[PDB]
């Protein structure tokens, strides 16, 4: 299994809503008896490894934004988070894995990582991730709406 990142950069003005997307291409589930821990977090383009360091998204860690479910299922974060923090992590049957961000601010800018962790035989060695930038801008130079740039 692998994770595909359709867009490498997201450019948005303050006040917008934006949805970051990772596509879980090819589930590779030899039947059931397998669950998937899926989460989002912020990180850096470090020297050694990327998506290594785990920084929060609006004071919410990877554990706050996590989804745990079997391959057959979909999953969503609770309404409490959406109302309070303005974050909604979502995952459906058709590959798609997303996080949605309400009322964008300059503090939201950064490098965002999706994680998908295959859990099987009480073991979770098989893990993949994606990365994409978000740039929240300000002023009259900033665009009317959000804009995403395709990956290479």
């Amino acid at each position, epitope marked *: 299994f692998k994770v595909a990142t359709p867009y490498s950069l997201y450019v948005c003005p303050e006040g917008q809503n934006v949805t970051l997307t990772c596509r879980l291409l090819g589930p590779v589930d030899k039947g059931h008896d397998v669950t998937f821990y899926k989460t989002w*977090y912020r990180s850096s383009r470090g020297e050694v*490894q990327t998506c290594s360091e*785990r920084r929060p998204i609006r004071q919410l860690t990877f*554990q*706050d934004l996590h989804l745990h479910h079997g391959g057959h299922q979909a999953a969503q974060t609770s309404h409490d988070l959406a109302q309070r923090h303005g974050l909604e992590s979502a995952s459906d049957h058709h590959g798609n894995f997303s996080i949605t961000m309400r009322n964008l601010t300059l503090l939201d800018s950064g490098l965002y990582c999706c994680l998908v*962790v295959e859990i099987r035989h009480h073991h*979770s060695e098989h893990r993949v991730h994606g990365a994409m930038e978000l740039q929240v801008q300000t002023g009259k130079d900033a665009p009317s709406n959000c804009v995403v740039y395709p990956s290479s």
Partner: antibody
Amino acid sequence: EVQLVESGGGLVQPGGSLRLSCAASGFTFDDYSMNWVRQAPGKGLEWVSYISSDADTIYYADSVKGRFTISRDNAKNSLYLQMNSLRAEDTAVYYCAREAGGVLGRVDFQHWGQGTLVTVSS
Amino acid sequence: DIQLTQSPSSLSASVGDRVTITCQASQDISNYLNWYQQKPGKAPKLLIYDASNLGTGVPSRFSGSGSGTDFTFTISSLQPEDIATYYCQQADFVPPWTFGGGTKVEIKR
């Protein structure tokens, strides 16, 4: 300074129940994730259970799952551990521990309590 | 479940000697390894977080390094007050958060 006072431990018979409390002070208990960690007499540390800041995420070790139930009262700056169907093996000192939080979103156990001994014996 | 093999289980070294403890993770754990100190009677106390980052008010003789699978904890010059059992602890994404088993540090006199 941050301070974490466990209480509620003591003697209890096999199959019995018992409830630990962890009294937090010197920080906004609301904002931080809390764990229970047990250490059996003269043995290493074992993690027991995890609890989110507003309790949305909860995890247990398999050895305690089904039996122990974690909770917190953010109004009372309090963390609890209901313990049911206790066995010989559950005999241990039980520490509540607060994860270093902050803007970095750390996950290490920077603040521990002094612990409360639980004995399981007839 | 990630197993942490911690080496050695016990240890004896003189005042001033370098002391190095090793933690071996059964999976890649990136740098998600915390190092605690448990003095006899006292509870555990965090010294290092995320492999190499020192805690506040922690003597600079204490240090740590490592990534992936192989990790170390090092006391530059062992002092009499550093008598304790040291544990390593993995801080992975998924819940079963396991500990080393520990290295007892006694001092040679």
